[PDB]
Assembly symmetry: D2
Homo-oligomer: 115 residues x 4
Amino acid sequence: CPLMVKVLDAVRGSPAINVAVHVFRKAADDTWEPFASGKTSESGELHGLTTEEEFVEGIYKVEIDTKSYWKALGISPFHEHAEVVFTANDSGPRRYTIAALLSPYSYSTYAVVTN
Amino acid sequence: CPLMVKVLDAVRGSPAINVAVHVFRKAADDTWEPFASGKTSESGELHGLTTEEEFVEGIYKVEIDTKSYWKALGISPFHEHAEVVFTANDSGPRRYTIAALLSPYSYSTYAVVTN
Amino acid sequence: CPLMVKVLDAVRGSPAINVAVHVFRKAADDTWEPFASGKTSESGELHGLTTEEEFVEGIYKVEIDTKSYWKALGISPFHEHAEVVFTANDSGPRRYTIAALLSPYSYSTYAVVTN
Amino acid sequence: CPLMVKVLDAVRGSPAINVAVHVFRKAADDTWEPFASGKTSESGELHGLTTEEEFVEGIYKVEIDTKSYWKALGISPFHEHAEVVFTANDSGPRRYTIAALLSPYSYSTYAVVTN
């Protein structure tokens, strides 16, 4: 599991469950190519998006579909999405945890990168 | 104005208005002595807490009364208050802005220290 | 000034100065069209990006060029940029402040929407 | 494990290791009584602070000794401590994860509360 996404709801103090996550990788033509996607579990985590073989060096974008999450809770939020754009594996393979803490008019994102 | 406090509401996307703020200074007996207090304005800011003369080097605590703010909005919060403890240090002229971004189960606090 | 961008540096406790900011508007072909851009001032703020006339309802993206900011300071960052995607909605008069608090491996973004 | 503390370093994108954590509980005389303490592990987590029997209803303060952590990394930070003050178990026993994301001039704290 070289890439994991974790999403927390800062209004309820709970994992954000069933949040759609789309990962893209920048292609040589500079466009965003679909790479992997999934939904967060009951723990607010999304495991198994990729493998060490497929997760090569590159620029990746993790799009967390926060607006659909808040709309299902009856909240009209500010953001469409939370986006996390980063270069991965440029100094060799690493394990990445991308976390997002959500509120209707704010989000925080952090990364924990381990070798 | 050497010390200003700013509070933002991440649920409503607005300044957090009428939030009580208490500032304390650590005494020689290691207890916290009341130093200044007020309520945030319509802009979520609290100005005029102290003066350059009174705001000497020392350890200060800013307590932002977040629970009463959320309860007034009908929202169940986690924290009793947001706390910011810091040492004021003279290293040329300084102005301190202590900011807090609030959500019911999370807060971020930052300081902007300028000359 | 219906749209303002503010950027803060959580490592130095200062406004993030000379940060490039690019604003885009979603077009009918679903691509992102350049809309406005600038660099943050000495106060970490970027004013005058647009006018009430031009800033119509639509989906906007604010890209804050955080990686170039950290690299100029000699700090190894995680993100390529901080991204803020939102819909501008007319529901009475509105002023949008898009803020970003930056650290090398994390950022918080919030919006203050006032009348 | 009804109470766990997790600390992350937002400058390095790593767990914050060997961070001292002190927990206090408000006594009937309104003073803060020592309750539990420990140091974060290699994963930035602190487990085993208390038991379901000992972690009764009350107001608790989690003091994370951030200044000593940054000073060991050669950084003179703004805050003395990160403090998290909350009422626990007032609607019956709950499991609490108290997380803190650290930077030299800012900290964010969130809680994940599960039944």
